[PDB]
């Protein structure tokens, strides 16, 4: 048979257990084999969570690896160069991004999002910041969101 398994691993730091472990060893494949080559395709990606799909055949021995796109909270912390975000969101800053920065993230995740417009991908991303103690353009993001709608920025687009 062929079974596909996705787990999110720390990029470069992938180990033989668990998260990857309970997810493959039932596929009758050797464990490190699908570990070396992960830390290969996620070298650049050091320290961050990233989705990894392992397409295994259980029959005749073989696997393959598809490195996916990191979650949004991840992409945010390495435009900030941080590892752990706020303990009390909206009670502390951590935590600042410029609107062009968020845009760059939005195009990366827009294709997995529901939003069919850039401006909506961005409003999404801003929402995630509201959960983390990050601010954009030096203000609460709930506000930047209002402004994109109010037609304040608008030049950063089209």
């Amino acid at each position: 048979a062929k079974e596909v398994v996705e787990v999110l691993v720390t990029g470069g730091r992938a180990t033989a257990g668990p998260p990857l472990g309970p997810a493959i060893g039932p596929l009758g494949v050797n464990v490190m084999q699908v570990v070396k080559e992960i830390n290969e395709k996620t070298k650049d990606y050091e320290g961050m969570q990233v989705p990894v799909k392992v397409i295994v055949d259980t029959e005749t021995r073989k696997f393959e690896i598809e490195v996916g796109i990191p979650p949004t909270t991840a992409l945010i912390k390495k435009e900030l160069g941080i590892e752990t975000a706020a303990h009390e969101p909206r009670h502390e800053v951590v935590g600042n991004l410029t609107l062009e920065q968020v845009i760059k993230i939005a195009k990366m995740k827009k294709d997995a999002m529901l939003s069919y417009t850039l401006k909506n991908a961005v409003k999404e991303v801003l929402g995630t910041c509201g959960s983390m103690g990050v601010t954009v353009e030096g203000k609460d993001p709930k506000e930047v969101q209002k402004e994109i709608d109010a037609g304040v920025y608008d030049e950063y687009f089209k």
């Binding site: 257990g17 668990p18 998260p19 472990g21 309970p22 060893g25 039932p26």
Partner: peptide, 17 residues
């Protein structure tokens, strides 16, 4: 610190049984 089929960070979990 131990079990079979039971955690997320260290090393135990689940399986046959």
């Amino acid at each position: 610190i131990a079990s079979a089929s039971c955690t997320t960070x260290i090393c135990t979990c689940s399986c046959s049984s």
